[PDB]
């Protein structure tokens, strides 16, 4: 169930309510996550919001997130080929 989504782009929700979107490359027992090319969003997860899709976006890069602070994950997009 985790290994399936590996290499995919994933939308992860934090306990404070942040949205981390990155390439899901690794996990573990605690659900500590490894996210490549990761950005953070605060205001929205866009479903094509006609005004704009992106406000308070930050480029982070290579991120290790601790599982304590993870709430949930959904598939955001397919794996980048690279």
């Amino acid at each position: 169930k985790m290994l399936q989504h590996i290499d995919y782009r994933m939308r992860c929700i934090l306990q404070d309510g942040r949205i981390f979107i990155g390439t899901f490359k690794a996990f573990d027992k605690h659900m500590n996550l490894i996210l490549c090319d990761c950005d953070e969003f605060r205001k929205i997860k866009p479903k094509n919001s006609k005004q704009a899709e992106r406000e308070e976006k930050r480029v982070l890069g290579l991120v290790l997130l601790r599982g304590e602070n993870l709430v949930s994950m959904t598939v955001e997009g397919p794996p980048p080929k690279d």
């Binding site: 690794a26 027992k29 490549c36």
Partner: protein, 81 residues
């Protein structure tokens, strides 16, 4: 021992960024990373929740009270997993 943990130990000696559970942001050289995510760092820049910065020579943060870490992008590019 977890796959992410091995990758963390790999970042020892590199410049990393750390956010705590309270949202203070510490950037500097990772000296030592323990199995439980306890982190010794040096020559830090800290950016508080109000936006202000400070400078510290030496710090050590408990693993539990870390929200996340940013590691070097180059280091990431594990494959076997």
């Amino acid at each position: 021992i977890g796959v992410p943990i091995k990758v963390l130990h790999e970042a020892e000696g590199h410049i990393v960024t750390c956010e705590t559970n309270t949202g203070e942001v510490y950037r500097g050289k990772l000296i030592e990373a323990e199995d439980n995510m306890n982190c010794q760092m040096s020559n830090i820049t800290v950016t508080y929740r109000d936006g202000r910065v400070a400078q510290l020579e030496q710090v050590y943060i408990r693993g539990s009270k870390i929200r996340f870490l940013i590691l070097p992008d180059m280091l990431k590019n594990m494959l076997k997993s």
